[PDB]
Amino acid sequence: SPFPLTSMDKAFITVLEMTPVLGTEIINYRDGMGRVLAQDVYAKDNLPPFPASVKDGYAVRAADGPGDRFIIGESQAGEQPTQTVMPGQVMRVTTGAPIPCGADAVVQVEDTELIRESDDGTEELEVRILVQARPGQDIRPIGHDIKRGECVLAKGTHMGPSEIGLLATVGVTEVEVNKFPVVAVMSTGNELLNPEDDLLPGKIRDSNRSTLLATIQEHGYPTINLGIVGDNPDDLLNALNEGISRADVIITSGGVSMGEKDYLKQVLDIDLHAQIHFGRVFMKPGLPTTFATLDIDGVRKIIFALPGNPVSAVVTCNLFVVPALRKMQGILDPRPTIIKARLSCDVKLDPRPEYHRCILTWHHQEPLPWAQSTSRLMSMRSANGLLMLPPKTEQYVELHKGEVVDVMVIGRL
Amino acid sequence: SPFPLTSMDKAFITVLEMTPVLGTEIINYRDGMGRVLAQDVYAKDNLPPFPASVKDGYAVRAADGPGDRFIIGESQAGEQPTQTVMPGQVMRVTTGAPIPCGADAVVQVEDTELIRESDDGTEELEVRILVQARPGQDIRPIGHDIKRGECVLAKGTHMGPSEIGLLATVGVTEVEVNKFPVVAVMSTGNELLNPEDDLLPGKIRDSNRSTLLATIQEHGYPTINLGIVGDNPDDLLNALNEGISRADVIITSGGVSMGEKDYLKQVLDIDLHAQIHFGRVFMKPGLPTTFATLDIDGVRKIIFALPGNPVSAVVTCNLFVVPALRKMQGILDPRPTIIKARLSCDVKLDPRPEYHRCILTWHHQEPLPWAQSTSRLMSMRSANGLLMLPPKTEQYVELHKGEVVDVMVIGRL
């Protein structure tokens, strides 16, 4: 029947509550960007694993105090020194080099004066130490940064470049992570042609498939292109069955209003036997947005049947689909970032919550960004926000330039 | 010699001023994410290309007024109607369907009552129109959204999903764009082992290469892994020559301070014959950061020789390298987004401007985010900002929790 109007808050919670978290797999750490760890990661070595110089200078005995010293040799990075530093002696050290036995502090070269070098001038022989070194000064002790057996990354961690670096550091080059969802995208309608086609009478080009696939790809998830499907229940069923076989998530657009050749809801329920959780949402745009799940064996497939209007499709994809994908790939709090911004122009409110693509810009020293709903130069930039306008009331019927509003971040700022 | 201390502002401007914009290439529109158009793009068709219904309803003659009408047929999406609507008649239409000849308005189904249908109930025969239609109501005229010959995207546009959708819409499936830079990354030092290696005496694992490659990959640029190179001028030269052959940009780390086995600056100048624009920057961390260019034939190569300390390397990569890469790939204003945030803890200022990775978080309804320099839960998130602290003065020697500071965005918020 005509599905109940579902509130935006209920629809959103329903998507998150009903979306599964995918299983795990082992990956190479270099492939970890944007992955969520499904294991704790432990250090199997100390960092540094030897006492290491913080400075270019000399390894000394602090008890020697300031004075003139014989340079017995050099500790070079990458090699364990063999000599022991005795009273009256020092060893040259470079940053990251091991501290030799017998030394207990480092004096940086700027707190020294060279006395004697070799004739060719390539070897230092004697040096004046000008300061009283503090015990342990300018040395990183064994384990100062990381200790053997320390947990350096917890399960649940959403990895960026520095986490990949940490895995490299501790030598943990394979890790268990959640899988990424595979997302299949289909367009529907007898009027649709491919982008590559010249127009024919009564027809237009399919843009949603491209826009949706790009949106998903921007977030790093693998995609499947299911093409254009006609307004025909058998064709829709066959396409959905392909999507279900090939992917974790199916996204369709078009054919979800109550029109005569809108078949998707019927096919989902009667033919595919999916559970439709909502089929209308009280929102602008996006009224006919539909969310269904299908359990086959012990696997839950998710299906988003988005409106056909191109603006509606991209808006609802960002509101509903992206957070579900984030939950599927193991992100613990998959909610989008919502920031406060100032309206750049007056806006009339609707009885429905309204959503509009916008561009966020910071002005000089002003603390809040401005939100400009999509000058010449502005066109050089792609939308990076979704303005989230409140429903109207007897009190508030309009918002004014400068008033503070919620904006969901949808692109790299 | 010991290079002059360059201010942060000068170093940053120097990088942008000396970095080239790469040439152009033709790509398929599906590959356009993050690319910058090097051509204006024009529509070769109207959108819609026929007069199109906005609603499910009936195509009517407004001059008929309200009343009872014979339904002569249906205009279905994807097909040009053949019948003409005469006085006293209407045609069913669906959203996106063409308006038949003879009709000049659409009345939505909710403003109608069905009078008669076929016995099987699959065909509507007569309908009551309850309203006086406004001329042209609920019709998108030819060219309403886009006109043939209109410029729909300007050169200089940095493309996201909606721009890809627009290309699909107008059927422009190949476009001229700036090339992306290819970025080669090398680590240096005799003490370094690969991540895959067990430790040996005096050695540590190479983490910078992984962190830097991931940082670059996060921005979408192709990379080349040049491996680990020893503290040896000949090996460094050979590696740099490989990077120059294989890539547009070379990033090294390590070996740029004035230590005894730090050879990079010498190799760059004497052996590679590159022009070093700065070799020290008055900043914390990142003092020894070095930027050079090399012109070969009519091609300018860029070389960033970053400090070896892992925190310094990732900070300077975000401050200097990423903006240069953005200029190379044709972004007109390649500067990073800097936002205002509140300090989550007291901080002492240094004579040098200081930079620290942080996490930005919005709290409930507070307009400004909090910046937390890198609770348990916080560790689940990767750094998304770089705190930019001002140099100290006689006046300001510390900043307090809650004070507003600049933060450069370095991850998806």
Ligand SMILES: Nc1ncnc2c1ncn2[C@@H]1O[C@H](COP(=O)(O)OP(=O)(O)O)[C@@H](O)[C@H]1O
């Ligand atoms: N893939 C697409 N690309 C561009 N326009 C589309 C696409 N799919 C549908 N449309 C257009 O969106 C409008 C609404 O389509 P429709 O199928 O009625 O959406 P729904 O029934 O889901 O609300 C129509 O003008 C239709 O031509």
Ligand SMILES: Nc1ncnc2c1ncn2[C@@H]1O[C@H](COP(=O)(O)OP(=O)(O)O)[C@@H](O)[C@H]1O
């Ligand atoms: N790739 C790397 N990974 C981890 N640590 C490194 C790496 N390269 C250098 N380091 C460490 O950074 C510190 C500084 O190295 P160094 O080569 O002296 O940097 P610079 O001379 O450029 O300031 C030393 O402790 C060194 O071991």
Ligand SMILES: [Ca+2]
């Ligand atoms: Ca349709």
Ligand SMILES: [Ca+2]
């Ligand atoms: Ca080194």
Ligand SMILES: [Mg+2]
């Ligand atoms: Mg429809």
Ligand SMILES: [Mg+2]
């Ligand atoms: Mg050094």
Ligand SMILES: [W+6]
């Ligand atoms: W230091």
Ligand SMILES: [W+6]
């Ligand atoms: W240092």
Ligand SMILES: [W+6]
């Ligand atoms: W709408």
Ligand SMILES: [W+6]
């Ligand atoms: W709507």
Ligand SMILES: [W+6]
């Ligand atoms: W609509």
Ligand SMILES: [W+6]
């Ligand atoms: W509407």
Ligand SMILES: [W+6]
């Ligand atoms: W409307």
Ligand SMILES: [W+6]
């Ligand atoms: W509506």
Ligand SMILES: [W+6]
């Ligand atoms: W509408």
Ligand SMILES: [W+6]
């Ligand atoms: W609609």
